Design a protein around this motif. Structure first.
Motif, PDB file in Angstrom:
ATOM      1  N   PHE A 119       0.846  -1.187   0.000  1.00 32.64           N
ATOM      2  CA  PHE A 119       0.000   0.000   0.000  1.00 32.64           C
ATOM      3  C   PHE A 119       0.882   1.238   0.000  1.00 32.64           C
ATOM      4  O   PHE A 119       2.077   1.178   0.301  1.00 32.64           O
ATOM      5  N   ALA A 128      -0.590   0.497   8.475  1.00 29.85           N
ATOM      6  CA  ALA A 128      -1.674  -0.232   7.831  1.00 29.85           C
ATOM      7  C   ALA A 128      -2.842  -0.516   8.767  1.00 29.85           C
ATOM      8  O   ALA A 128      -3.894  -0.962   8.296  1.00 29.85           O
ATOM      9  N   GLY A 129      -2.688  -0.271  10.065  1.00 24.46           N
ATOM     10  CA  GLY A 129      -3.766  -0.501  11.006  1.00 24.46           C
ATOM     11  C   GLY A 129      -4.619   0.728  11.238  1.00 24.46           C
ATOM     12  O   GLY A 129      -4.998   1.416  10.286  1.00 24.46           O
ATOM     13  N   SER A 130      -4.930   1.016  12.502  1.00 20.28           N
ATOM     14  CA  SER A 130      -5.749   2.174  12.831  1.00 20.28           C
ATOM     15  C   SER A 130      -5.095   3.031  13.908  1.00 20.28           C
ATOM     16  O   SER A 130      -5.261   4.255  13.922  1.00 20.28           O
ATOM     17  N   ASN A 164      -0.576  -3.985  12.845  1.00 17.56           N
ATOM     18  CA  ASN A 164      -1.174  -2.711  12.456  1.00 17.56           C
ATOM     19  C   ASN A 164      -0.162  -1.802  11.765  1.00 17.56           C
ATOM     20  O   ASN A 164      -0.451  -0.630  11.502  1.00 17.56           O
ATOM     21  N   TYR A 219     -13.201  -2.856  12.883  1.00 18.14           N
ATOM     22  CA  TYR A 219     -11.756  -2.838  12.704  1.00 18.14           C
ATOM     23  C   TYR A 219     -11.034  -2.121  13.837  1.00 18.14           C
ATOM     24  O   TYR A 219      -9.816  -2.276  13.973  1.00 18.14           O
ATOM     25  N   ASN A 220     -11.753  -1.345  14.654  1.00 10.94           N
ATOM     26  CA  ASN A 220     -11.134  -0.527  15.686  1.00 10.94           C
ATOM     27  C   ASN A 220     -11.698  -0.753  17.083  1.00 10.94           C
ATOM     28  O   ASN A 220     -11.180  -0.165  18.038  1.00 10.94           O
TER      29      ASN A 220
END
Lengths: 49, 49, 49
Positions: free
Chosen positions: B1, B20-22, B32, C12-13
């Protein structure tokens, strides 16, 4: 039985005895149903008779 | 990405690990935060693709 | 699952799941593309499996 499908919907009913006027109205009901490109449409209105 | 697309004929050399996570990890390797470079696989007896 | 909105970003979080491995679909496009049916299957599987 009722299974193996993808829809369920409950809401305010359409057919209502809205007269409440001891007759002389008779609650005319007119309904139209049609299916275009995966869309079911209903049109109606209640009028005196 | 990547952060976004590339302008035409542009070259990128950055090897920093994108989040790539949050959660904001401040550039620490692990979950992540996945390394943005993974290699090919060349076997001589595999599919043409 | 049908006739929904899918806040897959929230899922996702909101928890700590081992693998967010989506095959052929990027986690970014979960809030963009619209589908027709969702199959949700979930049980207990061995770590080696």
């Amino acid at each position: 039985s009722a299974n193996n499908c993808t829809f369920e919907y409950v809401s305010q009913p359409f057919l209502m005895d809205l007269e409440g006027k001891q007759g002389n109205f008779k609650n005319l009901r007119e309904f139209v149903f049609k299916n275009i490109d995966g869309y079911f449409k209903i049109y109606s209105k209640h009028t005196p008779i | 990405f990547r952060k976004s697309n590339l302008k035409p004929f542009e070259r990128d050399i950055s090897t920093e690990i994108y989040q790539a996570g949050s959660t904001p990890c401040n550039g620490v390797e692990g979950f992540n935060c996945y390394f943005p470079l993974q290699s090919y696989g060349f076997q001589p007896t595999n599919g043409v693709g | 699952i049908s006739n929904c909105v899918a806040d897959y970003s929230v899922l996702y979080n909101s928890a700590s799941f081992s693998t967010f491995k989506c095959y052929g679909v990027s986690p970014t496009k979960l809030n963009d593309l619209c589908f027709t049916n969702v199959y949700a299957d979930s049980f207990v599987i061995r770590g080696d499996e």
